[PDB]
Design an enzyme around this catalytic site. Structure first.
Site, PDB file in Angstrom:
ATOM      1  N   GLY A 154       0.834  -1.176   0.000  1.00  0.00           N
ATOM      2  CA  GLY A 154       0.000   0.000   0.000  1.00  0.00           C
ATOM      3  C   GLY A 154       0.888   1.253   0.000  1.00  0.00           C
ATOM      4  N   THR A 155       0.204   2.402  -0.229  1.00  0.00           N
ATOM      5  CA  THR A 155       0.737   3.684  -0.510  1.00  0.00           C
ATOM      6  C   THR A 155       0.849   4.515   0.719  1.00  0.00           C
ATOM      7  OG1 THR A 155      -1.260   4.650  -1.416  1.00  0.00           O
ATOM      8  CG2 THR A 155       0.358   3.754  -2.970  1.00  0.00           C
ATOM      9  N   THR A 156       2.079   5.028   0.980  1.00  0.00           N
ATOM     10  CA  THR A 156       2.496   5.828   2.078  1.00  0.00           C
ATOM     11  C   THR A 156       1.475   6.826   2.671  1.00  0.00           C
ATOM     12  OG1 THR A 156       4.591   5.656   0.912  1.00  0.00           O
ATOM     13  CG2 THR A 156       4.511   6.976   2.990  1.00  0.00           C
TER      14      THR A 156
END
Lengths: 252, 247, 241, 232, 245, 244, 204, 245
Positions: H31-33
């Site tokens: 997943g994205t920061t």
């Protein structure tokens, strides 16, 4: 797997539990049904093992569903009990709803419906029980004989063999019996049901049970003497046969 | 595949779960009962498993009714739920149908019935314990009974269960007499249980209670003659000591 | 395999689970019902004994169902417990409704259906208990039946369940006489239990026994569970002790 | 490994579930569609596929409501369900709130619908991709619904088999179709081009094209047969 | 492969193996062939018996749904017993609410909605069906807003409109033949005898009136199940025709 | 071994006890905290290490001592997910108790209800057992100082003093040694403050570590009140030790 | 009025030295029309005897019902139910419907087997043990029977004299009520003999 | 690790772990920061919203979602699973609003979420959650920031990170504490939030990201949550672009 449940369609479009239910039938007793033109004979092999078994208090393999519809069954007796009770309760319900007696067609389609429902679900297996449902129409004379399978398929057949070693009876039934001209008399009809069962018993007139259903709410179950008289007449005509070959051989 | 549900059986019969359930019983401590002609003595031990752990917060001897006590042998936690249920059903099933505390045979069956339901289901483990239930009523006298993991029960003259089962069983056979008093039973009970651990015995480490005579003292109230005090009695730590001095 | 669910059948076209339950009944002791025209004797064996076993103040392979039907027990007692209680409740439910005692045949039928349901539905275990039923109802007199674990029933004039079935049956049908007597049946039972059971002495405290007789008044049936000391007197008469 | 793909209640060591990626594959196995839009119109152009040439196609456009509608890509059993629920939400908004339901919120309830069967044992993540177009208060929208439930507001996207060639047609020409307004015909012209690049071994017919349009003063209308022969 | 034991359950191709498996059950069945024409839809079948005692005209493979939708079936009669009753319900309840002869296309969707259920419960529709159906249907009728139509219902919940379609054993041999001989210009008499030509070929029994059973939906005649005297007459007209060819 | 029966809790092994439930006794040393609780004489003290693994954390959120109700504290050893869940039931159950039975709920009963609940979770295979060991603390309405440890099996027994964690044995031997040589089960310092100092001394000795103030969280049940101490309240006790 | 008052019937029980007497009328009435004159009202399940007064439908159904519970009891315990224990069973059944209760008034009579003490108890619509060891009455003439019985009653009566006392009590009271009388029956329970004696009497 | 224990989120290994729960943190890594920055008078949320291609509609895709109107949530991990959790968060808030007539306190909000996640690691037919949620806001008890792990576990944080760029994030976050013991007031924390996502992206230097910053600030939004939008956002972009080069 792929035979581990009914909810597996299998890689061949066969429901193994329906298939194994069928294999189950064979283990039960032989049963034969033959229509006349003014009767149905519904006949069954009656199991023996010991002479300490009652026949006084003990169920027959034939059970009256109402009073003009009858049932014989083949398979596990334990399984069949529940089948027979439901078939009966519905037949009485039919007059609760419409005020008519049951039709023969209505009933067989229903008993296959009850198994079909069971088959459809995955939680419950269907019963391993095939029945022959015999009967006459409400106000009419036209003999009706029907078949159900564990799959939940029902059919009409003029005459039919189910249960242990069904095929070998079947072929004999086919040859002697005709669709074109079925037995004249109720008497002649019964003896044809006896020929078929004679084969599967070995020796007996005491392991052969005979019942008759006729129109107009007439069900009678024939006495043991009368079955003994018939197995003996079949052996008497059979002896005539052996000889008739000997004579024919001498002449020519 | 034969042993690994409650629903499965074997070509030798039974269920795996009952055999294993039996094994659970024998992992427990030794608990024993001896029936006398005027009483029943019930005894168990407590293993603290630290000097820090208190001996009285463990209650291995529990009144089911105030006429019927129980002990167990097996797993400690399972005991606790079953006693809470046993009371709970003791009041429900036969104190609003009978309106007084159940006869010994009846409650034995009701307790047995919970064990039976805990075998009956597939996906629900059976109990870790087998109980001894000893009790009194007027009609069947003093009595003593075993409720095994299966859901099955047996009445006994004397029996023992747990880890010390083989030594205790052979002692109980030799030493029982036709007729005996309660008082004498206390001493036979004590001697049997001492087989199981030596040099760690004493009336603080031994829990001992009886279903003997009534005590109108511990009834809690007075001036009503028709009712009786509790038949069940818990012996204190000083009373165990007196009886132990006399051996 | 095809023990794995109870709601699946084997490719043979048997059901291994039921067969397996049938083998459950051969790890418990013999039970014998013999019907005679002059009474039914119900006999049962206690498969567990010890010298500290209390067994002389208890009946536990003889349970009265109502006032006129009783059963003998062979199999698991935990299995037995739940179905006996249910049967007692239904038999007497009939009493309430119809104001007559339940016919023997209907109550066995009811109970055999429930057995089939536990195999047919859900994920429940089938029950590995075989009960010999003995009753009296006016419509067929003395009536004897026994039930399989499968969930079906057959009538008998004598039958044996429990362990060593095959041998026991052999012994009974050799020595049966069609009219029989109530006394001769008791005697036959003891003779048979003696041989199948490995307790050679075959003592009173190892035997449960019940006799159903109409001898108490007429039209009125008295079911009498034999009590231990009585069981000891009839072994002297048959000579076993 | 992949012994883990038989349950949707079991995760992988690589931080996935296997059933959800497989449900993604299922879209590709079906027909092809390209969505694209302008600020005053929204358009789906979808290929109808038939079983054999006596067979007469499969309806690939389901009209949701008179301001929204969607196309399908992948398995049809799956599509009928997802569509039904969505229509139910548009009719609920119209009755109780007197609103034309926003495309963004509607797409978001679908994402929530997908997770209901993902979490629970039994049921499955749905094996169809949906492209929803609509015209609300905030003007035209095109949403790309996924099996996972990832919902993505886009100017153009395409799903199904060999759909990467439509996105290449759309990517080059991105800024051009945004500037088109007031002319539905010209958004259709762009769509017809698009769905050409997607095909292999085929050619467009008057019954392959099914063209779906909603805009400012035009309600949702599905053109079929003899209404797609102006733009064939 | 090995992913087919559940009631869903993918599958690295991304298909539901369970759903697909049920397709091959249809080839078990008895051949069923339908040919739409703009004068009516003619629904013919093959009837198979295992012995000549089976009373051929007592078994159902062609059935009346209402008064203007008929169906022919191939597959299990077990799975068709529940399926058909649903369709009957549907049609009768449509006439109750609206006084309208149910549309062929909508009647099809109705069938196929029950069909969708494969779970033991799931979001969206509530499912009680614990397995696919194993029966396809040909749905034939007449509405007056789209004429005579022919649909093929599948137990996959896919419905395709068709102009001629065959299923069962002889599916493959029938479908090739129907590809070279469809017209919009067929009369009802050409349609009837076309069904019999194709039917003999994909049969592996002998053709008689009891291994056959044709029917039509034409609005005037309603749904008409044919007589065996009638069906014989066409079989006779069949033999006469190949002589000329 | 492995088959039925470290994959299920409804499947007994041939030992007699379920392996997975036992794994929960090996799943309570995953957070690496040690508690020591001892009884005063009108008070009960509980002290657990406070583990700060990174500075990015708030240091006052990092607690494991809980207020359950007016007169009940609890320290949980073992994973956070099961901690909250265990603690929630316990709070809820304490509240539920007044309304059914009247007065405040003593320690013993809280511990029994949590113990039966734990047995229930092992009875059904529908849930897993709880991964935490619960040690409930109270000063009782009339039975005064109490420590009750309830294990995830459901085994529950009270104490003179108790310890919990991966170094449990070491604080346990230090306690035996103390109470055996004094001859008293209790700690005979009749103020609550100087019991809390004794607790601090004992933990210091057994671990071999001196602790600062971001490294201990301290709860004190006094008679008819319960409170959890903040770092500057911890500081009075720490300077008490440090200069005697 | 009350459905209990409409159908009618009286039940009265008494105590003596190691005896109890329990008697009833034979009247069944549906309003002023007399239906039956020869239906009893006292039943028994084991050696514990039960009367039931009140609305007829609940009197027959509650006969059936308590029979039903006592026969389960008998089998389970392997002994006949005692009066003392049957008095609780009676309250429990009645309390199980509060807000649609059975319109009846049960009377329990027996002598304990465990002590041999004579025992009797009274009940009410929704039921509770109402203890005496004097006499219990119920029914439409219950108010006549309550004073009438008290004058006649003396304690420590012999079984044969106790008969005289109950008989007199019931007959004259019954006579001076419209919905009672009409024939009678009395059971005198000694210990192990029960004599059942039907009162010849004037019809109402 | 070993075989077994994996398959169902209720089975323990010997080690005292449950592989399924572990497997849930692993899933958030991909997943994205996401970051959270707590402040003395606010909280700032920032997130890296990856843009797959230049086809995406800019500023029209968010992972920042609101609860009541004073609580921010932003998730990393699987997007739709993350939605579900936030849905439920609205339900939690709403129910509290009815009863007590007030906005949720942040520790109240953390408790109820933490239980819902824990329940879904408790059963056999459930699945473990696959999402982390950095979340928090400002209330009547001041500012609080929490980070909820997939296990059912949470703690308070002064600065929090989860997602792909979480090692770059935590490292910086720690730096933030050393330079600012006062923790940075809310205004300068917007600009600063930007610089962390720009750094975190040197491990996500694949495709473009869209910087979305929201806040909830006591001093500068009146304790309510609102997005940072327009020129405020631009300033935060320009600072981050400068200091990265």
């Amino acid at each position: 797997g792929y035979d581990r449940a009914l909810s597996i369609f299998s890689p061949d479009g066969h429901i193994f539990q329906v298939e194994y239910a069928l294999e189950a039938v064979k283990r039960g007793t032989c049963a034969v049904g033959v229509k006349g033109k003014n009767c149905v004979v519904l006949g069954c092999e009656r199991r023996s093992t010991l002479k300490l078994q009652d026949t006084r208090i003990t169920p027959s393999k034939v059970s009256k569903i109402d009073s003009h519809v009858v049932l014989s069954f083949s398979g596990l007796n334990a399984d069949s009990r529940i089948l027979i009770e439901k078939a009966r309760v519905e037949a009485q319900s039919h007059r609760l709803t419409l005020e008519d007696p049951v039709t023969v067609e209505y009933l067989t389609r229903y008993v296959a419906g009850v198994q079909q429902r069971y088959t459809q679900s995955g939680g419950v297996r269907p019963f391993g029980v095939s029945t022959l449902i015999a009967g006459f129409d409400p106000r009419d004379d036209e003999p009706k004989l029907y078949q159900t399978e564990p799959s939940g398929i029902y059919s009409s057949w003029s005459a039919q063999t189910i249960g242990r070693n069904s095929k070998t009876v079947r072929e004999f039934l086919e040859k002697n019996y005709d669709r074109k001209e079925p037995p004249a008399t109720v008497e002649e009809c019964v003896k044809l049901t006896v020929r078929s069962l004679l084969e599967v018993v070995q020796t007996g007139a005491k392991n052969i049970e005979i019942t008759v259903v006729k129109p107009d709410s007439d069900i009678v179950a024939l006495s043991s003497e009368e079955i003994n008289q018939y197995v003996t007449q079949i052996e008497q005509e059979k002896q005539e046969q052996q000889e008739q070959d000997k004579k024919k051989k001498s002449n020519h | 595949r034969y042993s690994f549900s409650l629903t499965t059986f074997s070509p030798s019969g039974k269920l795996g779960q009952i055999d294993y359930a039996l094994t659970a019983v024998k992992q427990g401590v030794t608990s024993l009962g001896i029936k006398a002609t005027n009483g029943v003595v019930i005894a168990t031990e407590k293993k603290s498993s630290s000097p820090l752990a208190m001996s009285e917060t463990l209650s291995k001897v529990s009144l089911l009714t105030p006429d019927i006590g129980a002990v167990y042998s097996g797993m400690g936690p399972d005991y606790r739920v079953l006693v809470d249920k046993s009371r709970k059903v003791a009041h429900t099933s036969y104190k609003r149908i009978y309106g007084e505390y159940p006869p010994t045979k009846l409650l034995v069956s009701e307790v047995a019935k919970i064990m039976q339901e805990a075998t009956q289901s597939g996906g629900v483990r059976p109990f870790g314990v087998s109980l001894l239930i000893a009790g009194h009523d007027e009609f069947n006298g003093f009595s003593l009974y075993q409720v095994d993991p299966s859901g099955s029960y047996f009445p006994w003259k004397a029996t023992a269960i747990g880890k010390g089962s083989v030594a205790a069983k052979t002692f109980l056979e030799k030493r029982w007499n036709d007729e005996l008093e309660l008082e004498d039973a206390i001493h036979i009970a004590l001697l049997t249980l001492k087989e199981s651990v030596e040099g760690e015995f004493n009336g603080d480490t031994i829990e001992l209670a009886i279903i003997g005579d009534e005590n109108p003292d511990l009834l809690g109230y007075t001036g009503i003659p028709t009712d009786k005090g509790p038949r069940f009695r818990k012996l204190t730590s000083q009373e165990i000591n007196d009886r132990l001095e006399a051996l | 395999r095809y023990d794995s669910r109870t709601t699946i059948f084997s490719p043979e076209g048997r059901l291994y689970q039921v067969e397996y339950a049938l083998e459950s009944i051969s790890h418990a002791g013999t039970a014998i019902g013999i019907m005679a025209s002059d009474g039914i004797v119900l006999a049962a064996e206690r498969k567990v004994t010890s010298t500290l076993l209390e067994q002389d103040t208890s009946t536990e392979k003889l349970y009265k169902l109502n006032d006129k039907i009783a059963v003998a027990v062979a199999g698991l007692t935990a299995d037995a417990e739940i179905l006996i209680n249910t049967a007692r409740i239904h038999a007497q439910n009939y009493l309430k409704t119809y104001n007559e005692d339940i016919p023997v045949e209907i109550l066995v039928r009811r109970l055999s259906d429930i057995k089939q349901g536990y195999t047919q539905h859900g994920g429940l275990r089938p029950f590995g208990v075989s009960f010999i039923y003995a009753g009296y109802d006016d419509r067929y007199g003395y009536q004897l039946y026994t039930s399989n674990p499968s969930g079906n029933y057959t009538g008998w004039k004598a039958i044996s369940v429990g362990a060593n079935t095959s041998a026991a049956q052999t012994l009974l049908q050799m020595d049966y006489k069609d009219d029989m007597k109530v006394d001769d049946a008791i005697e036959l039972a003891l003779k048979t239990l003696s041989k199948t059971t490995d307790s050679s002495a075959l003592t009173y405290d190892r035997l449960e026994f019940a006799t159903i007789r109409k001898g108490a008044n007429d039209g009125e049936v008295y079911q009498k569970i034999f009590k231990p000391q009585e069981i000891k007197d009839i072994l002297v008469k048959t000579g076993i002790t | 490994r992949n012994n883990y793909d038989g349950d949707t209640v079991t995760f992988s060591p690589t931080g996935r579930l296997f059933q959800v990626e497989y449900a993604l594959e299922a879209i590709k196995q079906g027909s092809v569609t390209v969505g694209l839009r302008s600020n005053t119109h929204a358009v789906l152009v979808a290929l109808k596929r038939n079983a054999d040439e006596l067979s007469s196609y499969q309806k690939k456009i389901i009209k949701c409501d008179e301001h929204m509608g969607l196309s399908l890509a992948g398995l049809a059993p799956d599509a009928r369900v997802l569509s039904n629920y969505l229509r139910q939400q548009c009719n609920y908004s119209s009755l109780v709130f007197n609103r034309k339901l926003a495309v963004e919120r509607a797409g978001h309830l679908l994402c929530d619908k997908a997770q209901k069967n993902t979490q629970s044992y039994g049921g499955r993540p749905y094996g169809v991709g949906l492209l929803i177009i609509g015209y609300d208060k905030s003007g035209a929208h095109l949403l790309e619904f996924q099996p996972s439930g990832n919902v993505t507001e886009l100017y153009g996207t395409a799903i199904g088999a060999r759909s990467q060639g439509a996105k290449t047609y759309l990517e080059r020409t991105l800024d051009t179709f945004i500037k088109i307004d007031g002319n539905p015909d010209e958004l259709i012209k762009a769509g017809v081009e698009a769905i050409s690049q997607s095909l292999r071994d085929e050619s467009l017919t008057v019954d392959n094209l099914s063209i779906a349009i909603v805009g400012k003063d035009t309600p949702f209308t599905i053109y079929d047969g003899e209404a797609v022969a102006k733009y064939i | 492969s090995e992913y087919d034991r559940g009631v869903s359950t993918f599958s690295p191709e991304g298909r539901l193996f369970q759903v697909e498996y049920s397709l091959e059950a249809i080839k078990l069945g008895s051949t069923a062939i339908g040919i739409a024409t703009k004068e009516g839809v003619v629904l013919g079948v093959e009837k198979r018996a295992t012995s000549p005692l089976l009373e051929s005209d007592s078994i159902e493979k062609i059935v009346e749904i209402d008064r203007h939708i008929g169906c022919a079936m191939s597959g299990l009669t077990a799975d068709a017993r529940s399926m058909i009753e649903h369709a009957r319900t549907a049609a009768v309840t449509h006439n109750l609410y609206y006084d309208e002869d149910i549309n062929v296309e909508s009647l099809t969707q109705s069938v196929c909605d029950l069909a969708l259920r494969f779970g033991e419960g799931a979001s969206g529709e509530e499912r009680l069906m614990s397995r696919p159906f194993g029966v396809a249907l040909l749905i034939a009728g007449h509405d007056a807003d789209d004429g005579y139509q022919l649909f093929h219902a599948e137990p996959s919940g896919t419905f395709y409109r068709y102009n001629a379609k065959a299923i069962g054993s002889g599916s493959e041999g029938a479908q090739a033949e129907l590809l070279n001989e469809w017209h919009s210009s067929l009369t009802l008499k050409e349609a009837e005898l076309l069904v019999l030509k194709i039917l003999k070929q994909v049969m592996e029994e002998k053709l008689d009136e009891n291994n056959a059973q044709l029917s039509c939906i034409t609005k005037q005649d309603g749904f008409k199940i044919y007589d065996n005297e009638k069906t014989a007459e066409l079989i006779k007209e069949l033999k006469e025709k190949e002589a000329a060819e | 071994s492995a088959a039925g029966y470290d994959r299920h809790i409804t499947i007994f092994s041939p030992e007699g006890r379920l392996y997975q439930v036992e794994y929960a006794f090996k799943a309570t040393n995953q957070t690496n905290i040690n508690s020591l609780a001892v009884r005063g004489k009108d008070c009960t003290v509980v002290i657990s290490q406070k583990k700060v693994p990174d500075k990015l954390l708030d240091p006052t959120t990092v607690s494991y001592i809980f207020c359950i109700s007016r007169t009940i504290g609890m320290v949980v050893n073992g994973p956070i997910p099961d901690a909250r869940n265990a603690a929630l039931r316990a709070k809820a159950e304490a509240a539920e108790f007044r309304y059914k039975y009247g007065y405040d709920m003593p320690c013993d009963v809280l511990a029994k209800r949590m113990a039966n609940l734990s047995q229930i979770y092992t009875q059904r295979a529908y849930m897993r057992p709880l991964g935490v060991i619960l040690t409930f603390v109270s000063v009782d309405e009339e039975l005064g100082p109490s420590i009750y440890k309830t294990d995830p099996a459901g085994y529950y027994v009270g104490y003179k003093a108790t310890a919990t964690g991966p170094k449990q044995q070491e604080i346990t031997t230090n306690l035996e040694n103390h109470f055996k040589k004094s001859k008293i089960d209790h700690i005979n310092e009749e103020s609550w403050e100087k019991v809390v100092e004794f607790a601090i001394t004992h933990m210091i000795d057994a671990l071999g570590t001196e602790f600062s103030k971001n490294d201990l969280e301290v709860g004190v049940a006094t008679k008819d009140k319960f409170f959890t101490l903040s770092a500057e309240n911890i500081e009075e006790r720490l300077v008490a030790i440090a200069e005697q | 009025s009350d459905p209990s008052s409409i159908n009618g019937g009286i039940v009265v029980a008494m105590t003596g030295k190691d005896c109890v007497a329990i008697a009833c009328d034979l009247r069944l009435g549906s309003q002023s029309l007399g239906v039956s004159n020869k239906f009893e009202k006292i039943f028994h399940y084991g050696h514990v005897f039960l009367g039931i007064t009140g609305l007829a439908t609940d009197v027959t159904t509650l006969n059936e019902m308590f029979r039903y519970k006592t026969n389960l009891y008998k089998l389970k315990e392997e002994r006949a139910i005692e009066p003392e224990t049957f008095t609780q069973l009676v309250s429990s059944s009645l309390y199980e419907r509060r807000f649609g209760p059975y319109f009846v008034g049960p009377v329990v009579a027996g002598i304990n087997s465990k002590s041999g003490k004579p025992f009797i108890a009274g009940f009410d619509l929704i039921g509770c043990i109402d203890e005496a060891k004097d006499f219990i009455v119920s029914g439409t003439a219950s108010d006549q029977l309550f004073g009438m019985c008290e004058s006649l009653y003396e304690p420590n009566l012999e079984p044969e004299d106790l008969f005289e006392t109950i008989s007199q009590a019931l007959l004259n009271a019954a006579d001076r009520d419209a919905l009672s009388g009409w024939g009678a029956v009395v059971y005198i329970i000694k210990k192990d003999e029960v004599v059942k004696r039907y009162l010849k009497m004037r019809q109402d | 690790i070993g075989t077994g224990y994996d398959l169902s989120n209720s089975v323990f290994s010997p080690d005292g772990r449950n592989f399924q729960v572990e497997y849930a943190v692993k899933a958030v890594e991909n997943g994205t920061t996401s970051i959270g920055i707590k402040c003395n008078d606010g909280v700032v949320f920032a997130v890296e919203k990856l843009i797959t291609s230049k086809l995406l509609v800019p500023q029209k895709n968010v992972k920042i979602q609101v609860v009541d109107r004073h609580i921010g949530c932003v998730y990393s991990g699987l997007i739709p699973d993350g939605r579900h959790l936030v849905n439920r968060g609205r339900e939690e808030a709403a129910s509290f609003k009815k009863l007590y007539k007030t906005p949720i306190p942040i520790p109240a909000f953390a408790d109820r979420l933490g239980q819902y996640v824990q329940a879904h690691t408790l059963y056999n037919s459930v699945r473990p959650f696959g999402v982390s949620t950095i979340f928090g806001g400002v209330d009547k008890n001041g500012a609080h920031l929490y980070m909820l792990e997939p296990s059912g576990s949470y703690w308070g944080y002064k600065g929090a990170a989860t997602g792909k760029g979480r090692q770059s994030a935590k490292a910086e976050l720690e730096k933030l504490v050393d330079h600012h013991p006062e923790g940075l007031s809310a205004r300068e924390a917007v600009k600063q939030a930007a610089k962390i996502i720009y750094l975190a992206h040197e491990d996500n230097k694949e495709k473009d990201f869209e910087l979305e910053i929201s806040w909830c600030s006591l001093s500068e939004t009146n304790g309510l949550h609102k997005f940072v939008k327009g020129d405020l956002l631009q300033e935060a972009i320009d600072f981050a672009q400068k200091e990265i080069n």
